[PDB]
């Protein structure tokens, strides 16, 4: 029942319950003339919500806030963007205007600035070295090393054993490494192996685009990246 790309018009946002106090958000957006689905995460933080990633653009992110208000009814107080591309930061200005404090690593903020993308307000120190982990409310943020991008972070929800891989992790049906313009194909399998080693108890793995599954998404991603390489 997870929503697919052809089931969500561009501009609409769906929420999907992953575990108690954990949802994914699903949106669609047009990029270089093709439409893609994209996931983010919502994690309950007492009587507040932590958001992971925007819904890929200003209009989608406004729709995301409206869907959260309707379905959950708890305020989003903080957001983390997991890398500098528009499917993660596009909509940060909408969040910042709505009273959401926006965060990203200094690596993500520098790359977003250089690219002309929206820039989260606050900088997340303690994530500059591969294998670094920091606590942020109900989640752990982990920097696995360069993969889809040099700044990509992954997010673990310890209470639910949910691993949100962002664009460093591909869905099982994926046949390509996607947009590799900013990727490190050689380090990506090593970065996946660091994720596998650090989160062996993950029950749900959510990719940046497409269907959640289990731990197999990690190995599949290393395989996809190898097939792209040659």
Ligand X SMILES: Cc1ccc(-c2cccc(S(N)(=O)=O)c2-c2nn[nH]n2)cc1
Sequence ranges of the binding site for Zn(2+): 83, 85, 87, 123, 125, 148, 167, 209
DSSP percent split of the chain into helix, strand, coil, nearest 5: 25, 30, 45
Choose the catalytic residue: 25, 39, 148, 220.
Answer: 148
Only segment of 81-89, 91-99, 129-137, 184-192 that touches ligand X (CB under 6 A): 81-89
Stretch that binds ligand X, among 39-47, 118-126, 173-181, 190-198 (CB under 6 A): 173-181
Query: How far is the C-alpha of 189 from the C-alpha of 168, rounded, in Å?
Result: 10
Q: Tokens 């650090």 correspond to what residue?
A: 198
Helices vs. strands in the chain: H and E counts, helices first: 6, 12
Residue 84: CB minimum distance to ligand X, A: 9
Q: Which residues bind Zn ion (CB under 5 A)?
A: 85, 87, 167, 208
Count Cβ atoms below 10 Å from residue 169 Cβ, excluding itself: 30
Minimum Å distance from CB 69 to ligand X? 26
Phi-psi sector, 75: left (phi>0), alpha (psi -120 to 50), beta: beta
Point out the annotated binding site. 83, 85, 87, 123, 125, 148, 167, 209
Q: Is 87 one of the annotated active-site residues of the chain?
A: yes
Is residue 185 near ligand X by the rule CB under 6 A?
A: no
């Amino acid at each position: 029942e997870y929503p697919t790309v052809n089931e969500i018009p561009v501009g609409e946002v769906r929420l999907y319950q992953i575990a108690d106090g954990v949802w994914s958000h699903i949106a669609t957006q047009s990029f270089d003339g093709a439409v893609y689905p994209s996931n983010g995460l919502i994690v309950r933080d007492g009587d507040e919500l932590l958001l992971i990633d925007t819904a890929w653009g200003a209009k989608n992110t406004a729709a995301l806030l409206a869907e959260i208000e309707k379905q959950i009814g708890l305020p989003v107080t903080r957001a983390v963007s997991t890398h500098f591309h528009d499917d993660r930061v596009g909509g940060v200005d909408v969040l910042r205007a709505a009273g959401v404090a926006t965060y990203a690593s200094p690596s993500t903020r520098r790359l977003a600035e250089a690219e002309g993308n929206e820039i989260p307000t606050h900088s997340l120190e303690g994530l500059s070295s591969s294998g670094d982990a920091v606590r942020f409310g109900p989640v752990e943020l982990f920097y696995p090393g360069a993969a889809h991008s040099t700044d990509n972070l992954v997010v673990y929800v310890p209470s639910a054993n949910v691993l949100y891989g962002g664009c460093a992790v591909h869905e099982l049906s994926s046949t390509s490494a996607g947009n590799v313009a900013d990727a490190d194909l050689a380090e990506w399998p090593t970065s996946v192996e660091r994720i596998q080693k650090h989160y062996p108890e993950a029950e749900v793995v959510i990719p940046g685009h497409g269907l959640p599954g289990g731990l197999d998404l990690l190995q599949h991603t290393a395989n996809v990246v190898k097939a792209h390489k040659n």
